[PDB]
Amino acid sequence: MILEEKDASDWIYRGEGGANLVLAYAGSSPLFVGKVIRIQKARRNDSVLTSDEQHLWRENNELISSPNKEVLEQRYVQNVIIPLLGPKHVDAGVRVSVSKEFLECVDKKVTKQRPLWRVNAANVDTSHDSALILNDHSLFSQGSGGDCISVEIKPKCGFLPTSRFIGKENMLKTSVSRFKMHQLLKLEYIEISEESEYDPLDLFSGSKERVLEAIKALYSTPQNNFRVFLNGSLILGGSGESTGRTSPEIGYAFEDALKGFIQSEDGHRTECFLQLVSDAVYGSGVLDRLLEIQKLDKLDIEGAIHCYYDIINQPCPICKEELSLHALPLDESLKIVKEYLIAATAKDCSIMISFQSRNAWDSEPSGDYVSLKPTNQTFDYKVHFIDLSLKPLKRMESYYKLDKKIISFYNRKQKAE
Ligand SMILES: O=P(O)(O)O[C@H]1[C@H](OP(=O)(O)O)[C@@H](OP(=O)(O)O)[C@H](OP(=O)(O)O)[C@@H](OP(=O)(O)O)[C@H]1OP(=O)(O)O
Ligand SMILES: Nc1ncnc2c1ncn2[C@@H]1O[C@H](COP(=O)(O)OP(=O)(O)O)[C@@H](O)[C@H]1O
Ligand SMILES: [Mg+2]
Ligand SMILES: [Mg+2]
Ligand SMILES: [Zn+2]
């Protein structure tokens, strides 16, 4: 019911993004075995919903009357995302009461395993009385079948905008993925050391060869897009952050960690694992439905931003001294922006794919598996989406400014012919 200070020692750092700290359970309590706990951070840059937001999510009443942010996320996923992605690959999570000292002790306990820059930016909001308990998707099933190799992919946006509302100076956005353009900026801002090889357009292409190309690229330059876990412990990718190119040292360590699981010859396990992930992702069709949601961003931020100012009743600062978008009835403007924010969730979520050697003694043999040609192995697999966070309405403003910054920096770098 309530987590207490002394329970803190049973949770171990697992990872974090910009919004949450995620800890894996290491204790014995049948309650938490196979779970992770997801804990919101307080951003130092930064009651449950602004007035404009309650206006935005008016169709979803349970969601507007959430007594806290944990319940908000919980109801968002259950009532808005599920009906869109299906419930098979999604877990809304169960709330659990936490005491202030539990939070404080956890924050202090994991501090040293956290990236320095993540610590500078945010800490566990010790003013929340609740956290989220999720199933740990590095564990094959809730409640064994041997080891479990788990892969996390954060696919980003897999389509190009085609908007009538993209300015003349910015048409490159029509040609070059946002992920690719953003790479140049990050490099310029010293957030990464080398541009990623990953092309979201390949992963979402629907082509088996191109999906494998994406997976191979993810492997070489994982950044914050790719991680691999062996029974819940990280063996490739960054811990709470983006990581650098895969070096020979990293390649070897990863190759070794796969022994027994991928039953190929020493030195060849890695290529076999990459083929296995590719088959799993491609065969599950799971990316197609995600892409559909991402494409709820129909007009691009350059279009959607106009509706946003209408929704909040401010004169549009983007138009200066569109006859089209600003002539929309409140109802359509709210729809457009709400879908833009749902798309933003889909653009930033992750997929975790759990693998385990196919178990002949399952009482109902899974329909979902992949046959590895050479090794003569069959693996059952499961896919779950994670990090299906609700994006705050106010973020429409920085989405526009970030976008403007990406395209103009890219334009400038290109003009440097
Ligand atoms: O902190 P980072 O690892 O650099 O990742 C952030 C972070 O995503 P995660 O927290 O899921 O990792 C942002 O989300 P917030 O935590 O700030 O809510 C997200 O911003 P949006 O989802 O609001 O877009 C942003 O995505 P983007 O840069 O595409 O806007 C993304 O950065 P990456 O570009 O590295 O994924
Ligand atoms: N249900 C889960 N099972 C296993 N790992 C998880 C789960 N939820 C989160 N994680 C791990 O913790 C990391 C951070 O979680 P996430 O919800 O993406 O945080 P943020 O909201 O800050 O982006 C994820 O990238 C993933 O590696
Ligand atoms: Mg995340
Ligand atoms: Mg998030
Ligand atoms: Zn306008």
Distance 387 CA to ligand 3 centre (A): 5
Instruction: Please work out whether the CB of residue 15 comes within 6 Å of at least one atom of ligand 2.
Output: yes
- Answer left, alpha or beta for residue 237, where phi above 0 means left and psi between -120 and 50 means alpha: left
Q: Are 385 and 350 in contact (CB under 8 A)?
A: yes
Could you tell me which residues come within 8 angstroms of residue 352 by beta carbon, excluding any fewer than 6 positions away? 137, 138, 150, 151, 152, 153, 383, 384, 385, 386
Atom of ligand 1 nearest to the CA of 389: 18
Q: Where are the domains of the chain?
A: 1-146, 147-417
Burial of 393 (0-12, 13-18, 19+ CB in 10 A): buried
What is the rounded distance in angstroms from the CA atom of residue 342 to the CA atom of residue 290?
11
Q: Is the CB of 344 under 6 A from ligand 1?
A: yes
Side-chain-side CA neighbours of 61 within 13 Å: the count stands at 0
How remote is the CA of residue 88 from the centroid of ligand 2, in Å? Answer: 18
Distance 157 CA to ligand 3 centre (A): 14
SS3 375: coil
Question: From the alpha carbon of 224, which atom of ligand 1 is closest?
Answer: 3
Which of 290, 285, 153, 142 lies closest to 229 in space, CA to CA? 153
| One-letter amino acid of 335 | K
Answer whether 86 contacts ligand 1 (Cβ < 6 A): no
Closest residue (by CA) to atom 11 of ligand 1? Answer: 17
Closest Cα to atom 13 of ligand 1:
18
CA distances from 416 to 181, 185, 240, 333, 410 (A): 15, 15, 35, 39, 10
15 lines ligand 1 (CB under 6 A): no
Q: Is 386 in the pocket of ligand 2 (CB under 6 A)?
A: yes
- Of 218, 349, 386, which is best to mutate to test ligand 2, by the most ligand atoms within 8 angstroms of its C-beta? 386
The structure tokens 């709400």 sit at 338
Q: Tell me which fold the domain 1-146 belongs to.
A: Phosphorylase Kinase; domain 1 (3.30.200)
Of 48, 52, 45, 22, residue with least CA distance to 313: 52
Residue 392 CB–ligand 1 contact under 6 Å: no
Helix, coil or strand: residue 165: coil
CB 166 within 8 A of CB 173: yes
Q: What is each CA distance from 220 to 15, 361, 372, in whole angstroms?
A: 21, 37, 22
User: Is residue 128 part of an annotated ligand binding site?
Assistant: no
Quote the ligand 1 centre to 409 CA distance (angstroms): 19
For a mutational test of ligand 1's pocket, the pick from 152, 348, 352, i.e. the residue with the most ligand atoms closer than 8 A to its C-beta, is 348
225 lines ligand 2 (CB under 6 A): no
The coordinates were experimentally obtained by X-ray
Question: What is the rounded (10 degree) CA torsion for 261, 14, 399, 411?
Answer: -50
Report the C-alpha gap between 132 and 134 in whole angstroms.
Answer: 6
What H or E segment, with its residue span, contains residue 401? helix 396-415
Token pair belonging to 144 = 């064994």
